[PDB]
Amino acid sequence: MLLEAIFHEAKGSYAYPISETQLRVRLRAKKGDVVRCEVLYADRYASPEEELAHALAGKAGSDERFDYFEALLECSTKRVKYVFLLTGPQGEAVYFGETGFSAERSKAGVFQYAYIHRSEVFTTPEWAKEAVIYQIFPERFANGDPSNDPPGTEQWAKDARPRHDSFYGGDLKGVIDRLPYLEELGVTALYFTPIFASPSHHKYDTADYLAIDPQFGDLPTFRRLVDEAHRRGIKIILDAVFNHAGDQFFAFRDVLQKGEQSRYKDWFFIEDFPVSKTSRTNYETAAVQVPAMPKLRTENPEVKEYLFDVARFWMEQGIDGWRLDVANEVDHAFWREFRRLVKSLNPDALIVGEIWHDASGWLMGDQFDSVMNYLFRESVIRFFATGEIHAERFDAELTRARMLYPEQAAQGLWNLLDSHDTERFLTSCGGNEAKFRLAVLFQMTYLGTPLIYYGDEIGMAGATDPDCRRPMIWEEKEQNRGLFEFYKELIRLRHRLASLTRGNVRSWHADKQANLYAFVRTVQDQHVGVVLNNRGEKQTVLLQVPESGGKTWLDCLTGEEVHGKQGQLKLTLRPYQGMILWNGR
Amino acid sequence: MLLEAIFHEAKGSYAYPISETQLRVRLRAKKGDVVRCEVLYADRYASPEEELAHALAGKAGSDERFDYFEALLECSTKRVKYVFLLTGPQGEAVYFGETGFSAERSKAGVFQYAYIHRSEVFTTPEWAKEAVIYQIFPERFANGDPSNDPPGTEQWAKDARPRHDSFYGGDLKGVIDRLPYLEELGVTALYFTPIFASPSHHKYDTADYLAIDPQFGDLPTFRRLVDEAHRRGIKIILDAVFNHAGDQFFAFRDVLQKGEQSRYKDWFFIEDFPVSKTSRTNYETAAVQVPAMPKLRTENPEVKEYLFDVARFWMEQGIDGWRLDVANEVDHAFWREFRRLVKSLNPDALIVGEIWHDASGWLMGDQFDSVMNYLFRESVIRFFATGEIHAERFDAELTRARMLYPEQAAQGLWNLLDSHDTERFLTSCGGNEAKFRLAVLFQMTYLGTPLIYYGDEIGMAGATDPDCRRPMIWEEKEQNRGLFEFYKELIRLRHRLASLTRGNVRSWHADKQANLYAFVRTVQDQHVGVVLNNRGEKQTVLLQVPESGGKTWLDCLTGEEVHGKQGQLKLTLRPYQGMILWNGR
Ligand SMILES: [Ca+2]
Ligand SMILES: [Ca+2]
């Protein structure tokens, strides 16, 4: 076995506590090099001649190139040292520890998780563990008050095709007026893109962090939304853009006028004076050469304190969480402290980040609760929509992203299909609803938090920005109530099947030919196996089902009962059909 | 090449800044597996059509199983994305990125270091980079004040062989009287084991954090010691026992008297009252069943604040840093805040921890400045002392550990040859002074901060505790002035050769048969080579030396001037003789 491909670390995503006396440990190895992984451990202060504890690490999954083994160590003393006993195909015994590899245990040394502090056990809000988030782009969701529509607002019709500068008048009132609809669907939370006062159309260049932009509504209106949403069981998540402020931001304005003599000169990253010029920026800004968005020096305590105050303000209005924008550019110190604050005001406030790359440094538990799961979108798009990859490959990408962070994070990653910055998934599937349904079926049964982009639930289509931001279709006649009802059912099943919300994920079957993928969600004794026939052909499949997990299963989508014989389940899936088999326990 | 054995991450010890605009990158792969590692990178927002910047990753070293490539990235934007270009022994090329591996650059994906904030750049005290520390065992260094000796103190003589309950009267006053000696030796700091009010002999069970143990002196004397030491260019480091307190601790005693009625019961970990019993305890303690050492709940704001105040008090007295004890058992949050307090009070205050296992998590730059290099000792014991490992193996251990943490930490690790909890190194050398001397030569020229155990410089000997805690030999005729002068010369050389304090390390030669090891420390244009012939026989060797690094060398220890001919250097070493070649640049 290739010893240089085996990996572990007493930290990060490979060693972390799930409670004060339970330590989870993961081990990576060349796919196929290890067939049996066991952990021998003991208290760190245990006598040398003491009997070691045993814990078998079951194989948690495999990806494109590696195998991952996982074990749960019981540590009543909250202190543990451990060494891996890896067994290969030809029965070779190799010990693995901090010192390195060796046929003799003692020479391998041992890994150590010094101590488990409860304040360091990754914890996220309970409602978010079984939530269903709904993204709302205010300007295009619903116009509840025409009195606030800016000049040039265009007609609200299904045949309307937005342009970069188009205006439809969507506002908060609109949302309040539609909560009944959103309640019917079963969404548990609403996620709003920036909606704070700004002079631009997109509102990412914050003019006043303490006020709702006039075109969307006012503070009194926002409070009404918060409450009305709250009694329907819907939480509110606001989008915070702390990485940079807008060029209308009061503090920035003082710099544009007082320059060097500005009480806030150190609140930003300014090269030299005069403070500005057209087409040329002499101060750091968002991305590259964007004068409207001067970068904020979050490292500056005064800046820190203001942003925190901004945070305090809106949490006082009763919001439930924040989706951080371009957070990976704000110092960790800030986020570590932001968390501390946000949680102190409301232990149940959610903190979701947006980072387009391995976000581990932010998902250890002392910073964000989760991040947008773009890896999930890439995988479902290339698998369900374009077909660039087959089911077995789909399985790989899926497994790899999953082993990225600790389980507490994986469970609350937002699984999006699209957003206001990309084309609508139905478009991605080329108008093929049969494909859309299977992907939605997956989205609703996989590990993570399902996020629905406004309108997709009733069949809205569209190209990328700005064709993805078309006016919400409210004409019951123009809506795909068929698809809508589909979401309802799925959201329903996900709320009653504890396994779909808080269970683990283990691949069940993968076939590059049949392009059929199946996985099993498990929590306690309940098992729910999802089978995806991503192929336009009626197919039969024989699945392995060890009798231990049950002898009878129910397909929650058809009520059809399927029985297993001698460890096998014969399933017949119509073109692009998905099955949700509950073990009834 | 075997891709499953190649490793990298956009964080930790494999990706970190060294400046606000410079990012170091490390990559490892199977030994011999890769021949060229290039880093192609650009700003995170750079246009897809722009050319990528190139960066050559030199092989920073290699251990028993891996090769380590390291490169430096120039990021003027403080934002960078990059991909690796790896070539095998057969010229086959492949890109390595976050996405995975591919012959195509784009399909490899790209690693990303989102942003480099100045507050996150690992920064350690400048004086610590070129320091030489002397570990003082208060009770056994010098007795300047007979009136404060503990009852039953024994005669201070060379033939004395300490026992567990022995006493000799060493105290702070003694250290003061001997400050001239330390100054002559050349030490720039003193490390004191615990010296705070405690009922026991060892003083690890803190009774009073704010007072010096009467047998050692009092605050006035401590102030005097700090001042007399400072004027001599010597700093003061105290040992902080924050993981647990003594059972005589004002807080613990209160709970002991009032049980659940005490306002300090939540400062400890108690399962049920009343609180007390011998060999058995109803409260968590350091290690296993140690009544006199109840664990402090450092997670508690009150407990946190007290120790932080305790710190303030001593720093107000003028100390230069702390040695944390069992630091790996207190929460990280505590340690991060400790650092902020400490540096705000004195940016040049050192924070050294003691972890007996991979300490990376505490060495990212937001916690400790470095830790004791227990690894160094291990390699030195087995290499120079017992000879259990040969020069090539020694090479591996040394190299592997070097790559364990970020260069800023690696550079300041405390490299000890022994301690008060171990036998003296000379004894480990079975009394062989040649074996001992050669080790000191390596210690005084290798990467990290040399830590001299009191008396080792004059040839003290002894088995592990308590025989290593014999009273310091002060009678000049009874001291080994040869050894002493040896340390002095090596210590003086280390201060003049910038390479020896601020230079990197590269293996120069490793011969398992001749048991000769050589390395070179480099900074700017200066190169200093160290050749150690760890054999009791006269040996001759041919070292490589391309004319680029010079053709002339000087043995700083002997003054002998050697010359390289045709890129080769002829060296003749005497038994256990070491050579320090300075290229005079
Ligand atoms: Ca409106
Ligand atoms: Ca004394």
Curated annotation (Swiss-Prot), chains A, B:
Its EC number is 3.2.1.135. Substrate binds at H244, R323, H420, D421, D465, R469. It comes from the Bacteria. Its cofactor is Ca(2+). The active site is at D325, E354. Signal peptide: none annotated. CDD domains: AmyAc_CMD, E_set_CDase_PDE_N. SMART domains: Aamy. GO terms for molecular function: metal ion binding; neopullulanase activity. GO terms for biological process: carbohydrate metabolic process. It catalyses: Hydrolysis of pullulan to panose (6-alpha-D-glucosylmaltose). Pfam families: Alpha-amylase, Alpha-amylase_N, Malt_amylase_C. It is an enzyme of class 3 (hydrolase). The record marks D421 as: Transition state stabilizer. Belongs to the glycosyl hydrolase 13 family. Hydrolyzes pullulan efficiently but only a small amount of starch. Endohydrolysis of 1,4-alpha-glucosidic linkages in pullulan to form panose. Also cleaves (1-6)-alpha-glucosidic linkages to form maltotriose. PANTHER family: ALPHA-AMYLASE FAMILY MEMBER (PTHR10357), MALTODEXTRIN GLUCOSIDASE (PTHR10357:SF210). This is Neopullulanase 2. It comes from Thermoactinomyces vulgaris. The lineage of its organism: Bacteria, Bacillati, Bacillota, Bacilli, Bacillales.
